[PDB]
From Swiss-Prot, chain A:
Protein name according to UniProt: Spike protein S2
Glycosites: 5
Residues represented out of the complete protein: 713 to 762 of 1273
Function as written in the Swiss-Prot or TrEMBL entry: Precursor of the fusion protein processed in the biosynthesis of the S protein and the formation of virus particle. Mediates fusion of the virion and cellular membranes by functioning as a class I viral fusion protein. Contains two viral fusion peptides that are unmasked after cleavage. The S2/S2' cleavage occurs during virus entry at the cell membrane by host TMPRSS2 or during endocytosis by host CSTL.
Cystine pairs: 26-48, 31-37
Organism domain of life: Viruses
Curated annotation (Swiss-Prot), chain B:
Organism, scientific name: Severe acute respiratory syndrome coronavirus 2 (2019-nCoV)
UniProt protein name: Spike protein S1
Region of interest (Disordered), ranges: 11-33
Functional note: Attaches the virion to the cell membrane by interacting with host receptor, initiating the infection. The major receptor is host ACE2. When S2/S2' has been cleaved, binding to the receptor triggers direct fusion at the cell membrane. When S2/S2' has not been cleaved, binding to the receptor results in internalization of the virus by endocytosis using host TFRC and GRM2 and leading to fusion of the virion membrane with the host endosomal membrane. Alternatively, may use NRP1/NRP2 and integrin as entry receptors.
Subunit structure: Binds to host ACE2. RBD also interacts with the N-linked glycan on 'Asn-90' of ACE2. Cleavage of S generates a polybasic C-terminal sequence on S1 that binds to host Neuropilin-1 (NRP1) and Neuropilin-2 (NRP2) receptors. Interacts with host integrin alpha-5/beta-1 (ITGA5:ITGB1) and with ACE2 in complex with integrin alpha-5/beta-1 (ITGA5:ITGB1). May interact via cytoplasmic c-terminus with M protein. May interact (via N-terminus) with host bilirubin and biliverdin, thereby preventing antibody binding to the SARS-CoV-2 spike NTD via an allosteric mechanism.
Span covered, complete protein: 509 to 558 of 1273
């Protein structure tokens, strides 16, 4: 079975590439500008830097 | 003689309160505020809420 006519087709291929460059401050989310809560938080160490 | 003072805190308008004297309000500055026993720290600005 041999083709005698053809066609040129166009297809769309969608690919995600990036995401929203989120960033988080622990102190606001967890404590909310409260120094005492931050002081208690310091006992946890390097979770937030991580 | 026994007396049991039952209440519930910071969920409705307050009519009874402790003996601390009030102060003047400072707007557009982050301050340590206390309203009806609800404390906090932040900037207080005018708003419209029904
Ligand atoms: C091969 O096939 C293509 C279609 O895939 C043909 O193109 C059509 O031909 C008809 C008849 O000649 C026209 O009415 C159409 O307008 C053509 N298409 C377009 C997009 O213009 C082509 O003619 C065929 N060739 C042969 C030799 O059969």
């Amino acid at each position: 079975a041999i083709p005698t006519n053809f066609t040129i087709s166009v297809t769309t291929e969608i690919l995600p590439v990036s995401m929203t460059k989120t960033s988080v401050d622990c102190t606001m989310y967890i404590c909310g500008d409260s120094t005492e809560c931050s002081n208690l938080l310091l006992q946890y160490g390097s979770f937030c830097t991580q | 003689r026994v007396v049991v003072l039952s209440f519930e805190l910071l969920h409705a308008p307050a009519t009874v309160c402790g003996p601390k004297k009030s102060t003047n309000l400072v707007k557009n500055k982050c301050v340590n505020f206390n309203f009806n026993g609800l404390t906090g720290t932040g900037v207080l600005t005018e708003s419209n809420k029904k």
